[PDB]
Design a protein around this ligand. Structure first.
Ligand SMILES: [Zn+2]
Length: 380
């Protein structure tokens, strides 16, 4: 007897039919208070050594159907080690065809990043002499909005570098990226002995929000918070009831100041790591151009995964572009301001059939970007 369950952190699925392994019928559940549908995460038990054919009947009705083109789902026996599994898409339905090796398995859209993991990581990070953690406010559902500051005393004002992640809760790659970056700043693991963090603290103070959408995350949402708001459309006029997550963070950025800004996302459609810059802003000066180009050049050197060939086609500027964090910040502060995008699929330039794009590659990217930040501040 097969059983599909989803009542856990970030769980999401609607089961249509589940009584023959070769005829499992499913629907992407969708965001809790929004029409956007794309994230899925479920547990399947009772299928050891049985070929499971799991068809997502509403695949074409999802937020980004091209997200299913050349895409493989991820799976795990224990929530620790994740791997890609055989998946096909015909523009109408999506099907995972996989034979579980053990009694209990999970399938998901991307390697998850749980609330527990967040709490364990921040609970350890706060113990570093250079760390502090401040609760800026509460989410819709009373979860903390936590700001991690990493820095040493100013004896000359240090540059304020802001990194926010996971405004879109299903983009768990964003929190993995922050974890890799923070681990390097901590001098943990293989980062012990590395001089980049030390040099950085002489020039820069970091202000980091690892999870911009705690509620959306646990809800199994892709794009919205628990009230149905797209947080990355709330930056020009956030609300205490609808978008307290942005209200609290935007207030802190204004109070604290900002010299460099990075908004960390994942992209459904494109199999590339890329940035969206501020060049479309009418406020984009020659010096800003010089600075953005030079950071991008440094990031290309720091990380072979990062590239500029592929990305969003930069359409004409419209006033509502300021609803997006990196544009709002770019316009308001006149500083280096970027959206960074990681793929749900793989990096097509450097594919990995076993894992595609994942937690470890996202984290390596975050650690690499630190080295580009250092190069950058040492130049400007
Ligand atoms: Zn996003």
């Amino acid at each position: 007897t097969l059983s599909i369950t989803s009542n856990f952190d970030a769980g999401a699925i609607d089961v249509v039919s589940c009584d023959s392994p070769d005829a499992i019928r499913l629907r992407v559940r969708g965001d809790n208070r929004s029409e956007f549908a794309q994230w899925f995460y479920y547990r399947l038990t009772g299928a050891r050594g049985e070929r499971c054919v799991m068809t997502f009947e509403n695949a074409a009705e999802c937020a980004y159907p091209s997200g299913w083109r050349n895409y493989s789902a991820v799976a795990s026996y224990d929530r620790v080690d994740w791997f890609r599994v055989p998946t096909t898409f015909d523009g109408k339905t999506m099907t995972i065809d996989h034979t579980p090796e053990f009694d209990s398995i999970y399938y998901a859209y991307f390697e998850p990043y749980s609330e527990e993991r967040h709490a364990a990581f921040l609970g350890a990070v706060q113990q570093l002499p250079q760390a502090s953690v401040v609760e800026l406010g509460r989410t819709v559902e009373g979860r903390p909005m936590s700001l991690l500051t990493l820095g040493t005393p100013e004896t000359a004002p240090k540059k304020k570098v802001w990194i926010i992640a996971r405004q879109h809760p299903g983009e768990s790659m964003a929190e993995w990226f922050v974890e890799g970056l923070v681990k390097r700043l901590a001098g943990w693991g293989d980062w012990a002995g590395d001089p980049v963090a030390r040099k950085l603290y002489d020039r820069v103070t970091f202000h980091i929000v690892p999870n911009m959408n705690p509620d959306g995350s646990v809800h199994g949402n892709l794009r919205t918070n628990a009230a149905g708001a797209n947080l990355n459309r709330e930056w020009m006029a956030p609300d205490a009831e609808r978008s307290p997550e942005v209200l609290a963070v935007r207030d802190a950025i204004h109070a604290i100041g900002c010299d460099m800004f990075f908004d960390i996302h994942g992209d459904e459609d494109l199999p590339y790591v890329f940035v969206a810059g501020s060049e479309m802003l009418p406020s984009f000066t020659e010096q800003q151009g010089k600075e953005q180009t030079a950071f991008i050049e440094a990031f290309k050197v720091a990380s072979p995964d990062f590239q500029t060939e592929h990305g969003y086609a930069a359409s004409k500027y419209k006033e509502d572009a300021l609803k997006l964090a990196s544009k709002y910040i770019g316009h308001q502060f006149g500083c280096l301001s970027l959206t960074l995008e990681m793929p749900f699929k793989d990096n097509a330039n450097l594919p990995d059939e076993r894992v595609g794009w994942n937690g470890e590659r996202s984290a390596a990217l975050g650690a690499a970007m630190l080295a580009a930040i250092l190069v950058h501040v040492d130049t400007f």
